[PDB]
Design a binder for these strands. Sequence first.
RNA 1: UUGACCUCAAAUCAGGUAGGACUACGCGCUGAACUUAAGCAUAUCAAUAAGCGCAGGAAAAGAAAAUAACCAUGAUUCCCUCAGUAACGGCGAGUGAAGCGGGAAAAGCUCAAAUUUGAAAUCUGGCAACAUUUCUUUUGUUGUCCGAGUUGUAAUUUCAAGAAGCUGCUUUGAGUGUAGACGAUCGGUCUAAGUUCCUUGGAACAGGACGUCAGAGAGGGUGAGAACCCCGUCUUUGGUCGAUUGGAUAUGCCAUAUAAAGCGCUUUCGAAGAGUCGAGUUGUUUGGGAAUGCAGCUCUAAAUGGGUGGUAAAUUUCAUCUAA
RNA 2: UGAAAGUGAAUGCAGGUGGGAACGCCCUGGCGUGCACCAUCGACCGACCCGGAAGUUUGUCAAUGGAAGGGUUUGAGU
RNA 3: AGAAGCUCAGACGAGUAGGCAGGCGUGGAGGUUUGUGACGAAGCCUUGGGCGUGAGCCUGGGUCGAACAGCCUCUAGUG
Lengths: 96, 202, 147
Amino acid sequence: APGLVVGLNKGKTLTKRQLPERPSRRKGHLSKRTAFVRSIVREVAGFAPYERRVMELIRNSQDKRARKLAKKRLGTLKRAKGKIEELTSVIQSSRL
Amino acid sequence: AIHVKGQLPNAHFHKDWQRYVKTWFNQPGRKLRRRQARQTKAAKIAPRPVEAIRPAVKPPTIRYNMKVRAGRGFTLEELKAAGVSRRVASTIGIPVDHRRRNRSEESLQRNVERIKVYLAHLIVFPRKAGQPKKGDATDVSGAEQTDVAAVLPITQEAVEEAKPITEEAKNFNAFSTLSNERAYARYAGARAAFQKKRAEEA
Amino acid sequence: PTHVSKTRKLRGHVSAGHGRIGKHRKHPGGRGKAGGLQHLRSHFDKYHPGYFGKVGMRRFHLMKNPLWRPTVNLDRLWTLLPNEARDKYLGKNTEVAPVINVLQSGYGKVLGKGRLPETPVIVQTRYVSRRAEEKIKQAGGVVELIA
RNA sequence: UUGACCUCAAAUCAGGUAGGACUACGCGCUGAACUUAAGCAUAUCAAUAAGCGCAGGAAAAGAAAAUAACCAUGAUUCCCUCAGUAACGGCGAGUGAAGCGGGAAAAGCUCAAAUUUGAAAUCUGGCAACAUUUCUUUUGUUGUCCGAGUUGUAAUUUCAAGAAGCUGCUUUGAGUGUAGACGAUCGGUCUAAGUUCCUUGGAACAGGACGUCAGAGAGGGUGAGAACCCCGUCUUUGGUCGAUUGGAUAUGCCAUAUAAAGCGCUUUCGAAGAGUCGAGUUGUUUGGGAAUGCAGCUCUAAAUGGGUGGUAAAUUUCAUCUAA
RNA sequence: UGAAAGUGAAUGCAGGUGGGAACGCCCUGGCGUGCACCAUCGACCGACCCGGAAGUUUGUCAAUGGAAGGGUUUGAGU
RNA sequence: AGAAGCUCAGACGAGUAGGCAGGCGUGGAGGUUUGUGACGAAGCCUUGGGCGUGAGCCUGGGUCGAACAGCCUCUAGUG
């Protein structure tokens, strides 16, 4: 396959280089100050009404219903699942 | 209402196209204007060449990856290898392409020797006359306006001439290998699923 | 020009060669390809079959470059070489076999139509036909895949 | 009670700015119908005309929330090509792009998010001094008061990084004349040779003899076809003399590197834009077809998160890029 | 050539046959010879309908792959 | 024997719509003609002459006063 147009590792083999990491790709990495500030703001502000509703559903253990409500509120199931795991972490930490 | 031989008409002329007809009667005039502007730039910019050096890059498709063309600028990795800082490269006429990268050592070397040839043949005037600093030339009497293409052209890879036939090339079914690799790539996804389903089943 | 045309020979003739019984009217049969199933069906069926309806599946965002694959036959492989290389290698027994990179000639596949001389030859290509390879190996040469 | 501050007012207060015209070409908004489909309602005409708003000498666009799937390319614009193609269409009439590739031209960058904190280091204005000028018409400098500003003005940073550190080489003015040279520049000027004879005629600029000039035999004017009568034409990308400008050069003076900067290694750290993204929906648009863009409404994120990879969904990888 | 995935044009002197331009030989014909064009019989390439030999690795028992060979089907082919 | 020429013979000849061919005329462009013209160009008038089947063309006389034409090609706002 290497050097055969078709296959899995198709294409010309010309050594290899390790590209330097671009600073733009670091975006999305959670910073120390950003984590500190967001914790302060969460304490100051609280949760949105739909976040509260989801947390109650997670407490009462309707995981599917909480997932479907979060998808309804946020729009995509991926963002819903991220919010569920975010809110269940809040629940676990508060029980701690 | 269409009764003659030939293909069915396809003239996209149902708008107000005469309003937007573009004529080329100014083609000789524009050509002379571009010539005069080019000569005005040549005289105004001093000894410095009218065209900056460009890297040698490969076009990004199977239709064109066998050729070498001119790129936009030299990557930061290439400039570091050639020993030129990005701050001075723009000042001495070396373009900088922060977006490009060297995924292969071959592309890296290709442009590094291009910068090395440019640096060897470059006469840099001292900023203050008579006080040559680092990189500044000692004599600038022979400075001239030359063509970067003549000093350093874009070179195309040339296929090697006749080479001997070896036995591992003799025992190589090219068509069967092409068919096998295509089929291997086609069904690699199904194989990964089957190996998975086998694991949980086991 | 204009002086060797008609309307210089119909000057004087009434109706200008379009007849009296029917005349030259603006669009007596409709504009453009109007019809094809109603009153132009006779011309459309007998001279342009297959014009109406869909056949096949659509491809969205088709790009020609990944499909680029011009083909060359065996009977042109030696003409792809310079004249000096043909003189040096065609018909002469040498330890070193001439090589043709058809990709640099502008070809993505080597097809098998035609005959190939008996001298060994190295063919560098991306794709090749089954019997195109059979004739190249028959001629004593080899095919090397390029990518 | 006086005060401080906030908010909101007034003045023919001090100093400014806006409109209108123009609109060939620029950016938007708004927006048809005739027409075509041999009828006609989707469509087409057309994202056009009319209407409305706002610019410039160009405008707009622009340094990738871009392509691609390559051995990878690399801001934008325009040309050729892609291509009458992929695609959209009562799949009818019709409509219809983009990546690549070749060329023209090329140029890169600036903030927000950082404690200067051993020092608001920042700036408008009043006043007074000087200086400067396409210019008594222009444009600044320095000092000193009043204010603005900590609800954040400078310095430093922009992801291509950077920031703090770690030695160590390297680099350095936002200056002012004056002199002459070398270029450019509107403009005042300068410019070769028959008007000799004969004939015709009202007129010779015609015809014929004899010449002349030509780097000037372009073109006009002059009482009829004039290189030599006149203006011009050629020389001229030039002599000329009168002001302008340009980049160098000679030095003169002022300049606190007590600074600043590039580069190199960090066991490190690295702040990155929200009623915005995204989703649904309704319009309107597109070649975009299971929504291409835009807009309205509803819901509303996130932190290796968010975009995008042109068939919708869940899931898992991979590239790429880094919006608001 | 097919909607695509894809595959992709010499059994032969690049075949036979019929008529054929021009030429040659013989005594008007005959004999060769046959360009160009049609009629026709094949061969080859792609689809279509069978047939699954190797071979590739992954499931070897298989997965994948497609050879020979057959249809008298088809193409805007050689 | 402007071989694109010359020469011989035979048959034949209606025509709307329509097709084709060869010609005549007009404005402008290139070439050409030692081309015509104030001793009268162009235009115009004509019970003058001449040529061609024809489209047309030439010419005498009259008027007139500043330009115009033949041939080979190019072209079109060409009858």
